[PDB]
Amino acid sequence: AAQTNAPWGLARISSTSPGTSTYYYDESAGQGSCVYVIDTGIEASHPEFEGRAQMVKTYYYSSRDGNGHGTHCAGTVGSRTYGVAKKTQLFGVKVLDDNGSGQYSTIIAGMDFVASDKNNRNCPKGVVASLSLGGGYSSSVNSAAARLQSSGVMVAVAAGNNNADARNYSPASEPSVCTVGASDRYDRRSSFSNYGSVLDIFGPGTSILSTWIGGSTRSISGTSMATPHVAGLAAYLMTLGKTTAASACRYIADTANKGDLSNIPFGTVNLLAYNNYQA
């Protein structure tokens, strides 16, 4: 399938080269796969989700995404226009309040929730979790991410927006999960993207256009927005049977675009998420 004039992020993950505007993907598009967006929640009623998005858990008075960042990330994973896996099922775990903040214990509860809820969901092609959140290092948050990955969900996490080594940020520093740095449309490391040996892949992270609350759209930047690209790519990859949740992040690293990114620190992988789709 070919989506013309797609967001540069989508076109980039289906491209050996930057500067293109058409997203190419197998029409299965993550059908039968699931992506938990652990964030501020999802505007499930947004027309871009086509009834494929749904809140499954909130730890606050409402499951409504009063922030938009979780709706944005869910849009990058599997919205119809803005999404990697345009047919995946999106599940909202609102662990972040509408200010975008969440206690680690709530974030840990949401991760253990997904590890169990996936057994309440129909994901024959595989389960993915996209955590566009992060704070200082927490060996408990890392273990919660390790558990979620251990349970049979891919864990895609943001490297963080600190222009630092992600070793000091959780769940970015958890080695078993998939830590995603951010890149811009010129294949530069997104200036804000965290780096380091713990990073597993880079995704489109700068000026990412996707869904927003109020049925709208907007373009915002972050490793928190490269992460849904990789989470959507994972669900896309599990649906084609090219990988499993336990082996998706490495797979994406194995099939990535190598050495194409600029300003990658010495010691950080120079890998860009690439769907390897050949029309």
Swiss-Prot record:
GO terms for biological process: proteolysis. Ca(2+) 1 binds at P175, V177, D200. Binds 2 calcium ions per subunit. It is an enzyme of class 3 (hydrolase). Keywords: Calcium, Disulfide bond, Hydrolase, Metal-binding, Protease, Serine protease, Signal, Zymogen. Its EC number is 3.4.21.64. It catalyses: Hydrolysis of keratin, and of other proteins with subtilisin-like specificity. Hydrolyzes peptide amides. Residues 7-279 form the Peptidase S8 domain. Its cofactor is Ca(2+). Belongs to the peptidase S8 family. This is Proteinase K. The chain holds residues 106 to 384 of 384 of the full protein.
